[PDB]
Amino acid sequence: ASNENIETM
Amino acid sequence: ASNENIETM
Amino acid sequence: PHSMRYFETAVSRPGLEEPRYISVGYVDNKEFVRFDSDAENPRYEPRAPWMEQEGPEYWERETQKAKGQEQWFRVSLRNLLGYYNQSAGGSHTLQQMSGCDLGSDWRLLRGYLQFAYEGRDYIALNEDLKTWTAADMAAQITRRKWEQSGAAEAYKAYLEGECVEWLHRYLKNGNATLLRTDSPKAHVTHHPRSKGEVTLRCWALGFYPADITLTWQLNGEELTQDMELVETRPAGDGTFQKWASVVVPLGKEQNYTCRVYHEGLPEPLTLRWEPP
Amino acid sequence: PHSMRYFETAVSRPGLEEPRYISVGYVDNKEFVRFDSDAENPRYEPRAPWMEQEGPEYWERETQKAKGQEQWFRVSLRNLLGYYNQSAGGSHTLQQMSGCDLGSDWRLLRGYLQFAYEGRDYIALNEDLKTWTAADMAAQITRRKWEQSGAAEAYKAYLEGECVEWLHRYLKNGNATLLRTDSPKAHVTHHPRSKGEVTLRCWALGFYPADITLTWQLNGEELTQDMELVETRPAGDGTFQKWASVVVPLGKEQNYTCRVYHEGLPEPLTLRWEPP
Amino acid sequence: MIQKTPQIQVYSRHPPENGKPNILNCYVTQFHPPHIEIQMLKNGKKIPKVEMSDMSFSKDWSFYILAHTEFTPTETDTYACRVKHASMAEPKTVYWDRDM
Amino acid sequence: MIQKTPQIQVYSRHPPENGKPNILNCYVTQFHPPHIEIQMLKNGKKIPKVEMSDMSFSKDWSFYILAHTEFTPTETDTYACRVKHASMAEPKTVYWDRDM
């Protein structure tokens, strides 16, 4: 299952 | 002495 | 050895056009899921037969993550554009690789997390899963933002937790498929050339996994830089091919042996050019 | 051998800020003129003493060419931005090199004309001074535009004509300066290290032109990859420096000779590590 | 802009035999940006039915595609792959060599 | 974006002798884009009077700068050059070594 990024670059 | 370009890129 | 990886790409397009987001999941280097924002009905789709075992809720949950990821990449693309000095409109690429490696005992070897901007290293999570390595000045801005927000902690939690537990599940669900190997079938071809010389080409076809080693020997001695080889290439049916050639004198071909090493074989192949 | 070159750079700046244009003229690799759009009063300025011989009209004419060049680069930067998919605002670089090479007989060896975008090859005029080589797909658009407008013809006319006649004039006006050589002064330094070994470092200082060769020999035999050397570097006073070192056994230093080859010398230097 | 030139391999799925059906592959790797145009040619003429794998990238970040078509080779036919990419001033054509 | 990391050399104009005036050079080459920040340091402290050559580029298109300062070296003093550039995540400091 995939991961979700939170803080943007 | 320098050269002048005519036709643009 | 086992692994899971998600390979994500966001590509921005000319003018007003919105970016394309693509996510590809791999289990042991084999593609198992795919999401593509360019699809008529964008959703994560199964790409390996053993994935059909997953309920409709799996697909909806995964699809919703991708819709969020698409927006994350849109805002990240814009932020990078400014770090590297500009405003919107340009065609740019942002890529991400993440996942975990497991040993033969199914224990975590390492978590993995990297980013690229314009196909060049941007920022990586170090193997400690705690600290960051930025590739350049712009990337250092992301590093400080991520150090301030404690981003590494949530990555470490997924990499050591969720990533491992889902890979364990995938490995169990795709046991009969994932453990399978395809032995290479080898043969030698003979290509007479100039100076009384002949190219002896050793072919390895139909193998899976991709990892293989072909060697050429002159009466027991292995040949170094003298040997020419192609990059391992997909046959298109799930198997791979490779060849290794040597240039030898005509009439002396019988003194050369090719050997093929592959995990799928009961033992290494040994072969010689065989006349008609 | 003689040469003249103009090295031109246009750098676009963030947001509304207008681009910086810089042109640097070289005679036999030595800077002789410079124009910089960032100057309070932008004009071509003399950079070699022998240039002061030129009347005020020379400087006004040259300055006016640079003001036109600055605008040409502004429009070319914008055109390239679109070929590579975007609109204004970004920080980009456009560079140009042009000039001629002459033999010892002052006859034209070749004309030269190249462009770079973002410090990478973009388009070059081939040595025939008639045809163009584009580096990529975007550059090919310029190639076709330039083939259609017959741009190569006006470049060839300057390179074989005006460029040669002005270089001849510069060579005559700067005779006492341009023909001058500065012989290298060499010495060997001794740096004891581990394993009973010692670094022997051969220094060449105060030389002009930059071209030099340093060799190390063990009783007449020249040393290959074994020899360490720094890139030739400016001393800051118009001369250059270079060093070449070898790692030798302590007590065997007297078996090694350094040789220094430079056009400025009456004959090559030969030197040995000299104790106290 | 940042560009990586595609590397090309043209080859058959199975050892070729004139008159026997096979699959001709055109494996395009090591390129950037991801946009690319690949054609497959028979006797210098565009083959209409050409399958393309989906957009993928390797560990080194570079993109790769496998283009393919069914084919039945003969003594006289030649086959090629033609690639159009931002990194290249002109399209690149690589001929199929049955010995490679 | 397209970036080339600067190469750095730190060296004296003349062979050094403690107590004798000299010139310390910091020669920065092979970088892109042209914007760069160079500082020269004595005992880890910024030297105020540092001369910079004008913007120039080599045949390979890469930019180069020669930074310099007058200096009178002593037994105990150390000197360095610190370079800040887009290609680098952090500034790079290169110490002067009198043997190089």
Coordinates of N, CA and C in Angstrom, one line a residue, chain C residues 7-9 20 22 34 47 95-97 114-116 118-121 191 201 203 205 230-231 233-237 241 243, chain E residues 1-2 9-15 23 25 27 32-34 54-64 66 98-100:
Chain C
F7 N 7.1 4.2 -7.2 CA 7.8 5.2 -8.1 C 6.7 6.2 -8.6
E8 N 6.9 7.4 -8.1 CA 5.9 8.5 -8.4 C 6.5 9.5 -9.3
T9 N 5.7 10.0 -10.2 CA 6.1 11.1 -11.1 C 5.0 12.1 -11.3
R20 N 0.4 15.9 -14.8 CA 0.1 14.5 -14.8 C 0.8 13.9 -13.6
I22 N 1.7 10.1 -11.9 CA 1.7 8.6 -12.1 C 2.4 8.0 -11.0
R34 N -0.8 0.4 -10.5 CA -0.5 1.6 -11.2 C -1.7 2.6 -11.2
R47 N -1.9 -4.8 -11.4 CA -1.0 -5.0 -12.6 C -0.3 -6.4 -12.5
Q95 N 10.0 13.6 -9.1 CA 9.9 12.1 -9.0 C 10.2 11.7 -7.5
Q96 N 9.6 10.6 -7.1 CA 9.8 10.1 -5.8 C 9.9 8.6 -5.8
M97 N 10.8 8.0 -5.0 CA 11.0 6.6 -4.8 C 10.9 6.4 -3.3
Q114 N 13.6 8.9 -1.6 CA 14.4 9.8 -2.4 C 13.5 10.6 -3.3
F115 N 13.9 11.8 -3.7 CA 13.2 12.7 -4.6 C 14.2 13.2 -5.7
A116 N 13.6 13.4 -6.9 CA 14.4 14.0 -8.0 C 13.6 15.2 -8.5
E118 N 13.7 17.4 -12.1 CA 14.3 17.4 -13.5 C 15.2 16.2 -13.7
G119 N 14.8 15.1 -13.1 CA 15.6 13.9 -13.2 C 16.9 13.8 -12.5
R120 N 17.2 14.8 -11.6 CA 18.5 14.9 -10.9 C 18.2 14.8 -9.4
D121 N 19.0 14.2 -8.6 CA 18.9 14.0 -7.2 C 18.5 15.4 -6.6
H191 N 30.0 -15.9 -35.8 CA 30.0 -14.8 -36.8 C 31.4 -14.5 -37.4
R201 N 29.2 -15.6 -30.0 CA 28.2 -14.9 -29.2 C 27.4 -15.9 -28.3
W203 N 24.3 -16.5 -26.0 CA 23.0 -16.0 -25.7 C 22.3 -16.7 -24.6
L205 N 18.5 -16.7 -23.1 CA 17.2 -16.2 -23.3 C 16.1 -16.9 -22.4
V230 N 25.7 -6.9 -24.2 CA 24.6 -6.0 -24.2 C 24.0 -5.8 -22.8
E231 N 23.3 -4.7 -22.6 CA 22.5 -4.5 -21.4 C 21.4 -5.6 -21.4
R233 N 17.9 -7.1 -21.4 CA 16.7 -6.5 -22.0 C 15.5 -7.3 -21.9
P234 N 14.3 -6.7 -21.7 CA 13.1 -7.5 -21.5 C 12.7 -8.2 -22.9
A235 N 12.3 -9.4 -22.8 CA 11.8 -10.1 -24.0 C 10.3 -9.7 -24.3
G236 N 9.6 -9.1 -23.3 CA 8.3 -8.6 -23.4 C 7.2 -9.5 -22.9
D237 N 7.6 -10.8 -22.6 CA 6.7 -11.8 -22.1 C 7.0 -12.1 -20.5
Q241 N 16.6 -11.3 -21.7 CA 17.7 -11.8 -22.6 C 19.0 -11.1 -22.3
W243 N 23.3 -11.2 -24.0 CA 24.3 -11.9 -24.7 C 25.7 -11.3 -24.4
Chain E
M1 N 17.5 23.2 -21.4 CA 17.0 22.4 -20.2 C 17.7 21.1 -20.0
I2 N 17.5 20.4 -18.8 CA 18.1 19.1 -18.5 C 17.6 18.0 -19.4
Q9 N 17.8 -0.3 -28.1 CA 18.1 -1.7 -28.5 C 16.8 -2.1 -29.3
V10 N 17.1 -2.8 -30.5 CA 16.1 -3.4 -31.4 C 16.5 -4.8 -31.5
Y11 N 15.5 -5.7 -31.2 CA 15.7 -7.1 -31.1 C 14.4 -7.9 -31.1
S12 N 14.5 -9.2 -31.5 CA 13.4 -10.1 -31.5 C 13.2 -10.8 -30.2
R13 N 11.9 -11.1 -29.8 CA 11.6 -11.9 -28.6 C 12.2 -13.3 -28.7
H14 N 12.2 -13.9 -29.9 CA 12.7 -15.3 -30.1 C 13.8 -15.2 -31.2
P15 N 14.7 -16.2 -31.2 CA 15.7 -16.3 -32.3 C 14.9 -16.3 -33.6
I23 N 8.1 -11.5 -32.4 CA 7.8 -10.1 -31.9 C 9.1 -9.3 -31.9
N25 N 11.1 -6.1 -30.7 CA 11.1 -5.1 -29.5 C 12.0 -4.0 -29.8
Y27 N 13.5 -1.2 -27.3 CA 13.7 -0.9 -25.9 C 14.5 0.4 -25.8
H32 N 15.4 11.6 -20.6 CA 14.7 12.6 -19.8 C 14.6 13.8 -20.7
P33 N 13.5 14.5 -20.8 CA 12.2 14.4 -20.1 C 11.4 13.1 -20.5
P34 N 10.3 12.7 -19.8 CA 9.6 11.5 -20.2 C 8.9 11.5 -21.5
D54 N 3.7 1.2 -20.6 CA 3.4 2.4 -19.8 C 4.6 3.1 -19.3
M55 N 4.5 4.4 -19.1 CA 5.6 5.3 -18.5 C 6.2 4.7 -17.3
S56 N 7.5 4.4 -17.3 CA 8.2 3.9 -16.1 C 9.6 4.5 -16.0
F57 N 10.2 4.5 -14.9 CA 11.5 5.1 -14.6 C 12.4 4.2 -13.8
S58 N 13.7 4.2 -14.0 CA 14.6 3.4 -13.2 C 15.1 4.1 -12.0
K59 N 15.9 3.4 -11.2 CA 16.5 3.9 -9.9 C 17.3 5.2 -10.1
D60 N 18.0 5.3 -11.3 CA 18.8 6.4 -11.6 C 17.9 7.6 -12.1
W61 N 16.6 7.5 -12.0 CA 15.5 8.5 -12.4 C 15.1 8.5 -13.8
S62 N 16.0 8.0 -14.7 CA 15.8 8.0 -16.1 C 14.6 7.1 -16.5
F63 N 13.8 7.6 -17.5 CA 12.7 6.9 -18.1 C 13.1 5.9 -19.1
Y64 N 12.2 4.9 -19.3 CA 12.3 3.8 -20.2 C 11.0 3.3 -20.8
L66 N 9.2 0.1 -23.6 CA 9.4 -1.0 -24.5 C 8.3 -0.9 -25.5
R98 N 19.7 -9.2 -37.0 CA 19.3 -10.5 -36.4 C 20.4 -11.2 -35.6
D99 N 21.7 -10.8 -35.8 CA 22.8 -11.4 -35.0 C 23.0 -10.7 -33.6
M100 N 22.2 -9.7 -33.3 CA 22.3 -9.0 -32.0 C 21.0 -8.8 -31.2

